[PDB]
């Protein structure tokens, strides 16, 4: 009774869920918006022993043609989640509830992928997204990565800094900005805190940030980000589309297939030599900010890939 | 310095770690024990951008021949103070350890149950994967909808319900539960329902595409070895190959008609309490598969 050939997994309040919904409408399809944050209270899910046996709020969704996975909202600290109240009051019960929800919703996504749904970014990619594994995999497939050290050992850090020179530190997984490794950070009272959690240290690449969008083994666009160091009081960011060689294009496509994504925003960064190193592949990349600042279209090509799947 | 050809991930105070360590010891191999509980505060791990730049406590461990992954804390105060910061820090630690295991597996290490298998272990998907592949499974219903339960009971007859996650006793669904007030508590508490199988439980151990033994179960439980069919032995090897486990303890349960259904595969099944009460040898063949991968 409702068209589920294209499913968008995310909150309707998410701006990229909104963007893809508007694009899909403008192209004649209506997406089924699957909002996991309504699961227990305002939703109904039912799974049978057979893979095709999936029932959401009554209706059977055995196999969408394609799926856009914005988020399953698996932990209370996920992006579109507002869980600080429940976590403050009883963090154990809240974390358990989130884990239970995550199990079922993932089972749904993995079932769709098993029936043949083209899930734009399967959750199965997370194993390869693991950053200290991701960069090694990429490098061993022939993609340049920064000199890196993921560690909790202050000596390894001191020796790595001595081998490389100027360094940055950033999270192993995410959740903080990249900083420069200043001299204070190598002092004992600072560097000793690595005993709490490991940190990622890297050669300070001095060239420019580029964002390369890849959809279905085609580069949609490469956007270069430059920092306005002109006025020290209000530094802005300037994003502009650029041309890249076929070499860079094919390396980005190989990277996407290697990690295992269908829609990715590669973050790359150039060295002083002017050559790019791979910083990361994003499994749920955003595009609206870059779409606006660079005056390019990413939502369109994504919607067109999703629609192309329904004819496939 | 230490022999890194065979690695045992987990605390040395874990009883199965002790079993496997002594079992390897009595066979001629001293396993390196990767006590991950000492990771952040009392142990050093370092990863470089090259896959083989893996350094544990100063010593490089590039590619073990085999790894027995057993397991991978007190944070109540931290969680009450700032739960976002604490969750993120735990994610940092766990990401580094997962990256170690993944680099090893990609290098060629035979990891006995790789963490990648977790996606297939997802229960509401694991059972469907086993079903659509021709293996016998109980009729099931994961739900939070009272009507779906009322229809599932009316269809399969007597049924039981277990939790979505696990860690609670399987309970028989009676008609008292299906009444309005009683069942309405389900719309916020999803559970699994399954046709009640009246036959006996069997745990089948598979190690490298071979069934090691089968044990029937019935603080006083009786566990004794069973001879199961070559048909069922092949089915078990196939289920383990499909979920992606080099070593598993499969919980299966027979029905009234004498046909076993697969209940679950365990990604790190315990074997101490079984081997003892049944006078069978699980730790042995496991240590043997481990040492085999060294050749």
């Amino acid at each position: 009774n409702l068209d589920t050939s294209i499913v968008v997994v995310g909150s309707p309040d998410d701006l990229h869920v909104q963007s893809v919904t508007e694009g899909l409408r403008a192209r004649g399809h209506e997406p089924y918006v699957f909002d996991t944050q309504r699961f227990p209270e305002e939703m109904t899910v039912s799974l049978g022993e057979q893979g095709a046996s999936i029932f959401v709020d009554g209706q059977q969704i055995a196999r969408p043609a394609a799926v856009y996975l914005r988020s399953l909202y698996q932990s209370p600290g996920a992006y579109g989640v507002d869980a600080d109240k429940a976590m403050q009051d009883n963090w154990r019960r809240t974390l358990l509830a989130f884990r239970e929800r995550s199990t079922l919703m993932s089972a749904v996504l993995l079932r769709w992928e098993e029936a043949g749904t083209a899930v734009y970014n399967s959750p199965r990619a997370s194993a390869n997204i693991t950053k200290p594994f991701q960069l090694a995999l990429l490098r061993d497939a022939g993609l340049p990565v920064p000199r890196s050290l993921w560690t909790n050992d202050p000596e390894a850090v001191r020796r790595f800094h001595a081998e490389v020179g100027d360094c940055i530190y950033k999270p192993v997984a995410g959740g903080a900005r990249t900083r420069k490794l200043e001299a204070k950070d190598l002092e004992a009272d600072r560097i000793e805190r690595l005993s709490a959690a490991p940190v990622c240290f890297q050669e300070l690449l001095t060239g420019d940030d580029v964002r390369v969008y890849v959809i279905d083994d085609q580069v949609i666009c490469a956007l270069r980000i430059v920092t306005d160091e002109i006025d020290f009081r209000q530094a802005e960011e300037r994003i502009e589309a650029i041309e890249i060689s076929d070499e860079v294009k094919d390396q980005c496509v190989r990277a996407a297939k290697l990690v295992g994504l269908r829609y990715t925003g590669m973050d790359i960064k150039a060295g002083a030599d002017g050559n790019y190193r791979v910083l990361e592949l994003n499994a749920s990349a955003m595009f609206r900010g870059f779409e606006g600042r660079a005056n390019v279209d990413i939502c369109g090509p994504l919607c067109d890939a999703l629609i192309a799947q329904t004819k496939r | 310095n230490l022999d890194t050809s065979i690695v045992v991930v987990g605390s040395p105070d874990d009883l199965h770690v002790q079993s496997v360590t002594e079992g390897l010891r009595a066979r001629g191999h001293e396993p390196y024990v990767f006590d991950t509980q000492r990771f952040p505060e009392e142990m050093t791990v370092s990863l470089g951008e090259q896959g083989a730049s893996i350094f544990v406590d100063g010593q490089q461990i590039a590619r073990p021949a085999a790894v027995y992954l057993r397991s991978l804390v007190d944070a109540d105060k931290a969680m009450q103070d700032n739960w976002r910061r604490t969750l993120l820090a735990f994610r940092e630690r766990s990401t580094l350890m997962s990256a170690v295991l993944l680099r090893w597996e990609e290098a060629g290490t035979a990891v006995y149950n790789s963490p990648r298998a977790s996606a297939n272990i997802t229960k509401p998907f694991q059972l469907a994967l086993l079903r659509d592949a021709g293996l016998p499974v109980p009729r099931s219903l994961w739900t939070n909808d009272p009507e779906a339960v009322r229809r599932f009971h009316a269809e399969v007859g007597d049924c039981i319900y277990k939790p979505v996650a696990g860690g609670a006793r399987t309970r028989k669904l009676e008609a008292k539960d299906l009444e309005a007030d009683r069942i309405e508590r389900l719309s916020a508490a999803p559970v699994c329902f399954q046709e009640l199988l009246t036959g006996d439980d069997v745990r089948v151990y598979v190690i490298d595409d071979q069934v090691i033994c089968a044990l029937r179960i019935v603080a006083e439980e009786r566990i004794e070895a069973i001879e199961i069919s070559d048909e069922v032995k092949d089915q078990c090897v196939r289920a383990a190959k499909l979920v992606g486990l080099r070593y598993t303890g499969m919980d299966i349960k027979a029905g009234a008609d004498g046909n076993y259904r697969v209940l679950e595969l365990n990604a790190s099944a315990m074997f101490r309490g079984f081997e003892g009460r049944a006078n069978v040898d699980i730790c042995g063949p496991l240590c043997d598969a481990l040492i085999a991968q060294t050749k």
């Binding site: 698996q74 600290g77 996920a78 900005r177 994003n282 | 976002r84």
Partner: peptide
């Protein structure tokens, strides 16, 4: 924490 500003929203599945 070595990364002081960690917790202080740059959340998980943002990107």
């Amino acid at each position: 924490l070595f990364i002081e500003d960690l917790g202080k929203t740059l959340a998980i599945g943002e990107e």
